[PDB]
Amino acid sequence: DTELLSIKILNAGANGDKVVEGTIDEAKKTINFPRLDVETDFSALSIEAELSEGAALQSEVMDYSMDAETNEKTQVLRIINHNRYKDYLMKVRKRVPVFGADFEKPTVYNFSGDNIYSDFATNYTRCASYDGEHVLVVSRPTTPNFHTPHLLKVSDLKRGEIKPIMLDVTGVKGGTYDYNMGALINGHVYLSSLSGGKVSPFKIYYWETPTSNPEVIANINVGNIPGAGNRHGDNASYNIDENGNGFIFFGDNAATEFLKVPISGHKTVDIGNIKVLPSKSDATMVTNVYRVGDTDQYLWSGIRVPVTLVDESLGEKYKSKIAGEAVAPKVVTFNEERYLLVCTAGQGAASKASIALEVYDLTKGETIEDALKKFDEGENHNPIYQFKLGGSGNGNALAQTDYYIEKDENGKDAKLCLFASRTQSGFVICEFPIKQEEMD
Numbered sequence: 013d014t015e016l017l018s019i020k021i022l023n024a025g026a027n028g029d030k031v032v033e034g035t036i037d038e039a040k041k042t043i044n045f046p047r048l049d050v051e052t053d054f055s056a057l058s059i060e061a062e063l064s065e066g067a068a069l070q071s072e073v074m075d076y077s078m079d080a081e082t083n084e085k086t087q088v089l090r091i092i093n094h095n096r097y098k099d100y101l102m103k104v105r106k107r108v109p110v111f112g113a114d115f116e117k118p119t120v121y122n123f124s125g126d127n128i129y130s131d132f133a134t135n136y137t138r139c140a141s142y143d144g145e146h147v148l149v150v151s152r153p154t155t156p157n158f159h160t161p162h163l164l165k166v167s168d169l170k171r172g173e174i175k176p177i178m179l180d181v182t183g184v185k186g187g188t189y190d191y192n193m194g195a196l197i198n199g200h201v202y203l204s205s206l207s208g209g210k211v212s213p214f215k216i217y218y219w220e221t222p223t224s225n226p227e228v229i230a231n232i233n234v235g236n237i238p239g240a241g242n243r244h245g246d247n248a249s250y251n252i253d254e255n256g257n258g259f260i261f262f263g264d265n266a267a268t269e270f271l272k273v274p275i276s277g278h279k280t281v282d283i284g285n286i287k288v289l290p291s292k293s294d295a296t297m298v299t300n301v302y303r304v305g306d307t308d309q310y311l312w313s314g315i316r317v318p319v320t321l322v323d324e325s326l327g328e329k330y331k332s333k334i335a336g337e338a339v340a341p342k343v344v345t346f347n348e349e350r351y352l353l354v355c356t357a358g359q360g361a362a363s364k365a366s367i368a369l370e371v372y373d374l375t376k377g378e379t380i381e382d383a384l385k386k387f388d389e390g391e392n393h394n395p396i397y398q399f400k401l402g403g404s405g406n407g408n409a410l411a412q413t414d415y416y417i418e419k420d421e422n423g424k425d426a427k428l429c430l431f432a433s434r435t436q437s438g439f440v441i442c443e444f445p446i447k448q449e450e451m452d
Contacts, residue, residue, distance in 0.1 A: 013064035014096045019043055022058045026051035043089060043102040050106045054078055066093045076104045083108055110447040112349030113428040115397040117445055121170055124438030125402035131159050132438045135408045140433035143196040144416030150194045150203060161191055161203060163222050177222055184226050186213035193248035200278060206245035210235035214244055218279055230281040239288040241268045246297040247410060261301040267293045270301065270326060289326040298357045298409050300340045304380045311341040315359045321381055332384040333393055334372055337365035340413040347425045347446045349375045350383060355411035355432040363405035369432030369440055370395040403437030410435045
């Protein structure tokens with residue numbers, strides 16, 4: 013007959029004691045095995061086989077020596093008898109570690125497109141934020157819902173249940189709009205008013221918990237800020253660390269500047285150190301400035317401002333090629349990879365922006381500047397993941413991003429959860445597992 017009925021490697025693994033079964037494809041005359049530990053002594057693999065009556069292996073020991081660079085090697089396994097022989101191509105492979113999120117396995121909770129969150133169907137809601145536990149919807153009340161700003165518990169939304177938890181907004185008044193932007197940070201809620209001129213109150217409010225009374229933490233007289241523009245609060249980039257320290261950036265409507273507003277201890281706004289930073293008309297009113305990790309650098313982008321690495325005074329360090337009206341640029345580190353999370357805005361009825369959550373791979377490179385350079389230099393500039401929110405271009409295309417990382421019982425990253433929201437399109441939560449070794 014002359015064939016190989018079964019085969020095993022008897023001495024795989026660091027300790028040369030793992031028995032690994034082979035798969036024989038008789039039509040193709042091939043033999044495969046699951047990938048072996050990289051610590052295996054591949055120079056002398058001992059094998060055991062079942063053959064047809066009378067057939068012998070040439071040898072029971074095979075040399076699959078590979079250099080550290082190579083992950084696979086094929087050798088001929090010959091079976092012989094009294095006058096016949098048959099050659100099989102036997103492939104042995106090393107395990108290859110894998111990193112980051114598996115973007116091929118999204119779990120999506122969609123409140124956009126056909127399922128657009130109702131408050132997001134008008135320009136009376138221009139902001140939403142997410143922290144894994146809730147979604148904050150900064151809705152100004154309007155027909156027919158008349159919803160004030162509220163939270164939605166993520167566990168409810170995953171079951172398709174919309175159950176608004178309204179914030180206490182007693183005394184939350186002042187400004188051309190009482191509220192417009194906001195954020196969920198450290199389990200707290202922040203909201204800011206829209207100041208329509210020098211004399212319009214520019215207020216920042218804080219909720220310790222969802223059921224707390226509101227606290228006014230700032231009431232900024234824009235008229236007392238030398239160099240400030242006319243209107244603030246159309247956009248906001250809240251950068252507040254785990255100790256409640258950082259800056260809120262507020263670009264003026266005319267895109268002449270940003271107000272950099274310092275915050276410490278979660279609630280203390282330093283009015284004596286508000287800085288006016290130069291912006292440019294191409295940023296537009298839809299623009300954001302977000303801190304890279306716990307470093308002293310930030311990413312700035314806008315409608316006609318590609319994602320740019322800048323210092324804390326908005327001094328330009330590196331302009332990347334990531335554009336397409338990507339706004340709210342956040343750098344996410346997850347399971348040893350580094351991603352850029354953006355939402356494309358779609359500002360102007362004629363805009364051709366994707367209107368989408370987009371993720372770009374920025375893994376290769378030491379620093380964020382190196383990573384942006386390496387991205388720019390590569391052949392492929394497509395996002396590694398996209399979720400289109402639907403809708404079309406409008407005149408108030410404010411968009412937000414956020415993320416949350418779930419860790420396992422051992423403190424290791426397990427699940428990457430990404431959020432984007434866009435005015436008049438809605439919001440999405442997209443969850444991804446860590447990659448698993450292609451156990452092929």
